[PDB]
Amino acid sequence: AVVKCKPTSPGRRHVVKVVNPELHKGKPFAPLLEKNSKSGGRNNNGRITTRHIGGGHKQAYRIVDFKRNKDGIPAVVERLEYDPNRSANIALVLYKDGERRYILAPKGLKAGDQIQSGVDAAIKPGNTLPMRNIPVGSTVHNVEMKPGKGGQLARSAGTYVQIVARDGAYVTLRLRSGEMRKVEADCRATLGEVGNAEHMLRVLGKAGAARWRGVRPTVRGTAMNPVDHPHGGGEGRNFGKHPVTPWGVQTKGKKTRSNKRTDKFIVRRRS
RNA sequence: UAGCUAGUAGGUGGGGUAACGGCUCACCUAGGCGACGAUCCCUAGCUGGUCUGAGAGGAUGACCAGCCACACUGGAACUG
RNA sequence: GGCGUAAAGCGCACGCAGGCGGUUUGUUAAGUCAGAUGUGAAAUCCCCGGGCUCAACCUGGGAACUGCAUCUGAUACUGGCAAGCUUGAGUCUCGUAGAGGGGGGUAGAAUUCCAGGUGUAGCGGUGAAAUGCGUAGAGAUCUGGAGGAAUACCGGUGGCGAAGGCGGCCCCCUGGACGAAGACUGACGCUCAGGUGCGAAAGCGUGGGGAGCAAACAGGAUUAGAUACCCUGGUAGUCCACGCCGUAAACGAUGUCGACUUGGAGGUUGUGCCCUUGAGGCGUGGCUUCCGGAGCUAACGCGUUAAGUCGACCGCCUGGGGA
RNA sequence: AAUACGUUCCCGGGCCUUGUACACACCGCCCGUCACACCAUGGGAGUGGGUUGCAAAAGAAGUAGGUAGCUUAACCUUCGGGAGGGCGCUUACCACUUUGUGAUUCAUGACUGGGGUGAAGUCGUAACAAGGUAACCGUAGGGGAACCUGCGGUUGGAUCA
RNA sequence: ACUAUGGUUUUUAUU
RNA sequence: CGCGGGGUGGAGCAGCCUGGUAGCUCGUCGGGCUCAUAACCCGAAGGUCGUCGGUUCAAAUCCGGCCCCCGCAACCA
RNA sequence: AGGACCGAACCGACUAAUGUUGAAAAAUUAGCGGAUGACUUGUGGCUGGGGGUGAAAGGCCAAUCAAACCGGGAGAUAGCU
RNA sequence: GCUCGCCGGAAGACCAAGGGUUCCUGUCCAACGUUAAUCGGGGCAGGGUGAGUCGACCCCUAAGGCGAGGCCGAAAGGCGUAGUCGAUGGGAAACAGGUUAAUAUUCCUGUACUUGGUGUUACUGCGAAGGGGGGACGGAGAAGGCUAUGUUGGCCGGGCGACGGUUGUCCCGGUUUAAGCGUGUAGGCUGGUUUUCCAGGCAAAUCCGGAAAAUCAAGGCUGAGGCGUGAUGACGAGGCACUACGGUGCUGAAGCAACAAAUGCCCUGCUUCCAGGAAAAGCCUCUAAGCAUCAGGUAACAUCAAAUCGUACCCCAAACCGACACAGGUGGUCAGGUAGAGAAUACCAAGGCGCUUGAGAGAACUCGGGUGAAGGAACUAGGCAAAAUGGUGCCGUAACUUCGGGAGAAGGCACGCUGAUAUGUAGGUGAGGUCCCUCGCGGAUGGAGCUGAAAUCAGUCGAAGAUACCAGCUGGCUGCAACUGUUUAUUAAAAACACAGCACUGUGCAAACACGAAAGUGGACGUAUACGGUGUGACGCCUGCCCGGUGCCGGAAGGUUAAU
RNA sequence: AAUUCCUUGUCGGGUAAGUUCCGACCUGCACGAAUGGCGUAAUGAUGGCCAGGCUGUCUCCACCCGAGACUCAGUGAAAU
RNA sequence: CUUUAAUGUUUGAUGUUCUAACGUUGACCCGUAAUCCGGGUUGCGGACAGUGUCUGGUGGGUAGUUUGACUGGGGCGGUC
């Protein structure tokens, strides 16, 4: 759900939040908690490597088991929880052996319902049944771009991803990025969907409300002195150049992809 | 014309009057009215009747019959 | 007095007060009418006198002033309060066709993109021609894959629906209509100011999406010019999760209910029958196309699904320019 | 002298039917901007009375209750004064008179939208015939005017739709 | 294909 | 400031630079198409080539004067 | 509840006055601007010169900056005073 | 010394740091002191600083550093594992009577108490560096309890009147006693028990975690403060004695009730919202290791140590910091009446101070306050300055608005003292009578006494009841600007920058991008509703053309063309 | 117009009189649609403009009063 | 001498495939019941990344340098 604030007292007028009563809010399961230390937007080489960073209110990290080490174990989803670290929210998995792990919160938000692991598992949602066993046309989430490498590709909020085609010992899926991509089909994925999908409807409303979120204000390149950014202030309304980043890259149209290692996995782009 | 009261809405004991009344001083409560047109401004006294027409309807009240209001303009008491 | 079209039913469904309401035995007697007691003065309108030049007028008598106030009577009928009655109405027994509604599943032509081959100056189009795509391989042709709108033909003497409308294939859920012999309440009904509900489109709003087509704008032509048609492109929009609006030729110009009447050609759907020598026929309801008799309208025509006939309820009309 | 298959299609005519927003009859009819002298209304920086709501200024006389001090008509009286009024004071209610912000109406105004009339002009030629791009309705984007281009609806259209 | 335009006013009714 | 152009039968500009030499599209009048004017196709008349001179065999051009115009422009005590 | 209004602590400077051989190479008064916040503050750490840090001023980097502070090259160089 | 006066959240007072004898005693005046100077936060010589418990060390750790082996970098230098350090964070024991010129949670005197070691007897599995539990930590909001405290009463000690009066109108002095223990109370928290058990707790587990069978209730926890107790001692006004009284003891009164009360204590509580909020160790407990009439454990009893650092004096201050005996600054901390919500503003308590040349003078004038006739913004670049306004509730309140605001709009009315109803009522609090039980930091009923709102009526008073201080001037036209933020330390305080919002675009993850000799980092423990960047500036109207230049995206035939 | 050279453009309104202020022009030698153009409220230590309240700002300045000026005694400078 | 099958085959590319090179930004084994990454085995990629010599292009990121003399002060035009 999504809510706007009432314009009572100055500054509240434009503030829009995402809200959900079907999802729990509180403290995390302590054996999967760490404080996760800040870099400050600086590295071990003594210079700034990031921008728009600093300060903010107190926050910890909820440890999600993206890279898995075993299969076959029966489980139940014990909790469905909010997570400040990710737009996708979090769910607590309780395995029959007395073991707990975190996963991304499934679209159904349902607690106390069983899920099975391994190639013996039923063709049912949320089971740890790898793509070699699944029908084409199924929805997967957190699709595991390369097998054994764990949860990456299509794992942020509102994602589902559908398996479109088969190509021998591989399967091909379609992305909202205009890309259609082939994967080695031993990939596990989450055999389902992820929730939220409302996070782009938020409106920050205030000029200070990013500050408590660890964000710092950043000056326009043509407003600072010519010694720090290739733009550089004038002279009123000067520019007289092609627009660039603080490091000389043309801000529009100019491309920067240079990988050239894995082109055979990418079937279509800008589709 | 979509707002209107507030002695208004419903009770209590004296005082005032020929006499009803929140007439009038106290005290006991918080409503009452209205689109099914409350209420307020603009204009205007009203009527026996007169004028019109086949009548309905419309217009109109001087002059001849009958009330009200008003007395430089505003305001206070007496007399009865 | 009018509301199909001159002037008007206010785009379409539900519905409280308001207003309306079958048939019968009681009962109240407000309304009504009856009867009586008061009133409608003086004038005045009308008829006939008196008196002042005629007459007016001022006066005398009649006749009027069809009205109004009350107290009794009657209760046909409206209101009101009891009580029946089964016909209106609603409920029920049984089911069908179709684009009626809702949620999901799904596919192809053409096109474009993805990935490639066969092959060479054309493509595409006009009265005639460019631009553009095009030799760097455009068009043609074909293999594999995928997207999206709209769902070709059927398709119209057709269905379903309150209007707008709604079609494509399958499944689940689901609204409303219609009839015969009986059952049930026993006037429970009709309409309805306000009230509560519903877009073909275009637009806007929050967020997506871009094949097809295309306002705007560019390129080239035609031409006086061409702000148009032609033609190479193309945004918004169309599509979707939806929201707001209430928009129109929402025009098949018929507000909603009730009832009587004259024929035919034709189709469908119930329901009941047939001495069914039929490859079917006939009653009787609902829908329903097109001619046609009466009657209404200036005229077209309406024509039993009325613009004939006639009760109940709610809105609208009274020159145009200007609005 | 020659040419004539044969009337497909122009010019100019006739009859017939369908349209007609035509009728000195297509040399018909017809739209609006611009030029310009006017008239009324709307909008309006403003200029200003009329009038009034609410909250408030105000305290003359009057009425109601108090009422020192000083006094004195009628009653009482020991003839000294006593009683109540007077006077002079007081607590209420209080005629005028004085503002603050609202509301509303009539006057009035630079400049001005749209509308009707006069100047028959300038501009193109938008609707009526199949009206030279079928028309129209809603609604966006454009547009010197008149319009034009799209999506859906509908014929107040039309060529064997 | 393309080929536009034409002010206002200006007739018949017998006794 | 200083710089660079234009002045061409009536209008507005090609021409010039490259010397063997006066024009185009309109305009004016008269035709052709027509009932007629436009659109359109033809016919006809007229250049101090701003204008005074210079120079040469020879021009509007080479080139000085006397005027008329525009563009950049006043960016220094 | 509060990137609201009052306001002491704290933070900060709109005006007038004082001070710049002044108590002081930024302190003072009287009216103050803010004051649960994009706040402010105690403490430590990390970032360094053609580099840092900056809601980014040739500002800040210990009185210092169109390259600070210290030393070396250095007894720089000066058609001139 | 007495008196007068000023400050009184400070001009009172407690304490670290950091400074460095400033604390004590003497004599030196030469120098010092913005003046004498006999004095000393001066010069100089000597005196004084005691710890099981304090605060620190040990233990543990953040940010971060240090870093063998290992790695990058001509090099300087950097990275980083095993490990190791480290505060502004977490952990064992402390309070205060005695007092000397100067010393004391340290000695003296009491009481409290923790950690490490040695060892016997009896019985006996103990135990990590690992695992679990806990430690444990967002910011506000709102009741209750409580106490040093407040203010009277009583009591003991004293006063009773030169003065208007002071034996029912009294006044002053005093009325005190820790940490901690025991009881286990306000306030606050809340399911256990008995049994078996799987691939988890990257090894082990009897403890967690999870699965099943069984079974029980009304108990399980935390504890401010009271009381006892620490303490028949201490403290105590008053009384008394003796050797050089040259100090140093002896003695000793009252020692209590009422109500209100914190910022402190219950409390990091509870409640509440949100941006979702350190870890480890001690401690409890499970097991791994290792070992055995050892060590450990359980019970009884003896017993050795508490080492390591600091301690005087200062303290918002002429002992710190500002070169100064400096218009100033400096880390922690407390806070009563009377009015008021007062770390507002006024006067004062407790308490301190009269501000480091002094004395004449008393002139226009200057620095700065107070008052002003009549007129008023006429002045001035500028109502600039000055002056006025200034509180609460009720009555009342427009244009414009993003419908929240504008608005405490504007304009005005009220605002003392006494009496009364209830001469003090409602809430809170509080002693009996009555009533009940295991019992007791006892409950039920009850409400004399204490504290005391809220409202109305009746009298009385001045010029004036927000009486003083402190505390908005008001409205209207326009531009600009969203509102809150940021700034050129000393000429700009803003319309700039930031910023909600927006377009265009790059980025498929070993992302793009950034640091940079190059690794390893940062992006991100993020993965296309995720991240990068530019500019414009929230919200509403919206937002056209030119592809010639130059760049970018894309394209490959033809031509120029290097190494070779 | 925070843009207009020449411009007090020219004009209405605001004053007795207005280079500014308020509302226009369409003549922008030269604004202009994210180097964004168009626009409004609370509001800002924001420029201008109109009025009242209060006022020694101004008219004409007056009186009152600390601390300094003056004179001592101590200590006792300096730029020049 | 044409063009070429089958057999033999040098070579730079294009395009697949294979894999010992190389990688792991996977797993496993052990260091280590180590938050470095060393070795080993496997899975999956795969002849490349990366880097040095030659070389074309571009290259303010970075360096070094100048803009003559006269102009009756400086300048526009003029002058050498």
Side-chain angles (χ1 to χ4, degrees), chain A residues 1-2 18-20 23 82 86-89 105-107 109 156-159 194-200:
Chain A
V2 178
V18 188
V19 294
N20 184 348
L23 187 77
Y82 182 81
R86 71 200 78 248
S87 59
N89 295 321
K107 189 175 180 185
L109 304 179
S156 303
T159 53
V194 85
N196 193 356
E198 291 171 276
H199 200 57
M200 85 307 184

Side-chain angles (χ1 to χ4, degrees), chain A residues 36 95 98 112 125 138 146 157 170 183 200 202 217 246:
Chain A
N36 184 48
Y95 294 94
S138 309
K146 181 171 169 65
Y170 297 82
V183 297
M200 85 307 184
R202 79 195 193 279

Side-chain angles (χ1 to χ4, degrees), chain A residues 225-243:
Chain A
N225 196 265
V227 300
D228 208 83
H229 191 302
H231 284 186
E235 225 301 275
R237 308 301 197 256
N238 264 27
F239 199 71
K241 63 178 56 68
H242 303 314

